[PDB]
Design a binder for these strands. Structure first.
Ligand code: DTP
Ligand code: CA
Ligand code: CA
Ligand code: CA
Length: 341
DNA sequence: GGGGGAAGGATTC
DNA sequence: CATGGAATCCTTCCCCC
C-alpha cells in the first residue's frame, strides 16, 4: 500500500505569479475584499515572501497592510484557479487510475501498482513534480507513505516545493513523537480538547478507555486516531462526487431587515444556480453568519427537484425562520443546494 | 432497539 | 478589523417496524 499525495504550493498566489511572472520574488497577497469599507476583508492566501513576515490565510487584509504595506494585493479569482487546478488533476490521472481529488489543490494517488517500493515511488514523485512544473509552471510538494494520513503529513513536513517519503520505520516513531495536533483532521478545537484528556501524541490514544475518548471527541474521530496509532488506518483512495453547491456573500452593513438582506440572498441563489449547471437539487439550505460570527441555517428537502423559482420562494421563507429565531444581526448570508437528482 | 431520513449544528482544511 | 466552499460527523427528533 503506497500513497503519493500532491499538494500545490501557495496555490492561489502561485497561480497569480504564473499569470504575471514579474510578481515572482515579491510578496503576493490574494484577498477577498468584502466592500464593507476601504480594504475590508481577509487574506485568502499569500506566497512565502509574505508568509515569513506573518502575512497568511485568514488574517484581516487591514492587518496584512500594517505588516507589509508595500506588498502586492490581488483580489481572489476563484474561477481561474479552478481551471488551472483541473488541468493539473488531469495530468495526475496519467500516473494512476486510483485518484482522490481532495480539494482544489490536493490529490492522493494510489501507486501500489505502478511501483513496488519507496525508491521507485520517490522517483515517480519527481517525474510528477518535474512534469507539472514543465507543463503548467506550478511547483508542488509531494508526500509518500503507507496511507493518506501519513502521505499528507509527509507533504506538510516538506513544503514548499518538496518531496518526502515516510517509510514504515519512520511512521512507527512518528506515532510516538509527532505532536497530535499536526495530525490531519485535528484542528484547534480537537487539539485543545485532547490535552484535557492527556493526549499529545498518537500513541497516547492507546492508553485511554475508548468510551471516555468517544465522549470527548466523538466516535468517528475516536476510531480514527486509534486506528492510526495502532498503525491500522487504511482508507481507500476514491474519487469523491460533488454533493452540494452554494454561495455565501458579505453584506455592506449588518442587518435584521428582510428586504435589506434579500438582494444578497438572491444574488447568492443566481450564482449557485449557474454553478449547478444541469444538476437538480432536492434540498436547499439558507445559511447565515450572525454578527458575533455564529453560523445559523435553515433548510428543506423536497420530494422533487427545485426550480430556480421554487428556490427564490423557499429561500425567503427559510430566511424568515432564521430571523424569527436568533434576534442577532446578520453579517453574511447565502444558500446551499444538495441532494442532486 | 433500531433503520432510515431530515434538521440544526460542530469542526476541519 | 476576520472571506469563502464543501465534506464529514454529531446530537435530537420522528415515524414506525
Ligand atoms: N482561509 C482561506 N480562505 C480562503 N481560501 C483559502 C483559505 N485557506 C486556503 N484557501 C484556498 C486558497 C489556498 O491557496 C488554497 C490551498 O491552501 P493550502 O491550504 O493549499 O494553502 P496554500 O495556500 O496552498 O499554502 P501551502 O503552500 O502551505 O499549502 O485553498
Ligand atoms: Ca492543500
Ligand atoms: Ca497547498
Ligand atoms: Ca492542526
Amino acid at each position: 500500500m503506497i500513497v503519493l499525495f500532491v499538494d500545490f504550493d501557495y496555490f492561489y498566489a502561485q497561480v497569480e505569479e504564473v499569470l504575471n511572472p514579474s510578481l515572482k520574488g515579491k510578496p503576493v497577497v490574494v484577498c477577498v475584499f468584502s466592500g464593507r469599507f476601504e480594504d475590508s476583508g481577509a487574506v485568502a492566501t499569500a506566497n512565502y515572501e509574505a508568509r515569513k513576515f506573518g502575512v497568511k490565510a485568514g488574517i484581516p487584509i487591514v492587518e496584512a497592510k500594517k505588516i507589509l504595506p508595500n506588498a502586492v494585493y490581488l483580489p481572489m479569482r476563484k474561477e481561474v484557479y479552478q481551471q488551472v487546478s483541473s488541468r493539473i488533476m488531469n495530468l495526475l490521472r496519467e500516473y494512476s487510475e486510483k485518484i482522490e481529488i481532495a480539494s482544489i489543490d490536493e490529490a492522493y494517488l494510489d501507486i501500489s501498482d505502478k511501483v513496488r517500493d519507496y525508491r521507485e515511488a520517490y522517483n515517480l514523485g519527481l517525474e510528477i513534480k518535474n512534469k507539472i512544473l514543465e507543463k503548467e509552471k506550478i511547483t508542488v510538494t509531494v508526500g509518500i507513505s503507507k496511507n493518506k494520513v501519513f502521505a499528507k503529513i509527509a507533504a506538510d513536513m516538506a513544503k514548499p516545493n518538496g518531496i518526502k517519503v515516510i517509510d514504515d520505520e519512520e511512521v512507527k516513531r512518528l506515532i510516538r513523537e509527532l505532536d497530535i495536533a499536526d495530525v490531519p483532521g485535528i484542528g484547534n478545537i480537537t487539539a485543545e480538547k485532547l490535552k484535557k484528556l492527556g493526549i499529545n501524541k498518537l500513541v497516547d490514544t492507546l492508553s485511554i478507555e475508548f468510551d471516555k475518548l468517544k465522549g470527548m471527541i466523538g466516535e468517528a474521530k475516536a476510531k480514527y486516531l486509534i486506528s492510526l496509532a495502532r498503525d491500522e488506518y487504511n482508507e481507500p483512495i476514491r474519487t469523491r462526487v460533488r454533493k452540494s453547491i452554494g454561495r455565501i456573500v458579505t453584506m455592506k452593513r449588518n442587518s435584521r431587515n428582510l428586504e435589506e438582506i434579500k438582494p444578497y440572498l438572491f444574488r447568492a441563489i443566481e450564482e449557485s444556480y449557474y454553478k449547478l449547471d444541469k444538476r437538480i437539487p432536492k434540498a436547499i439550505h439558507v445559511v447565515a453568519v450572525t454578527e458575533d460570527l455564529d453560523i445559523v441555517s435553515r433548510g428543506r428537502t423536497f420530494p422533487h427537484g427545485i426550480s430556480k423559482e421554487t428556490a427564490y420562494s423557499e429561500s425567503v421563507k427559510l430566511l424568515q425562520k432564521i430571523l424569527e429565531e436568533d434576534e442577532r444581526k446578520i453579517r453574511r448570508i447565502g444558500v446551499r443546494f444538495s441532494k442532486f437528482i
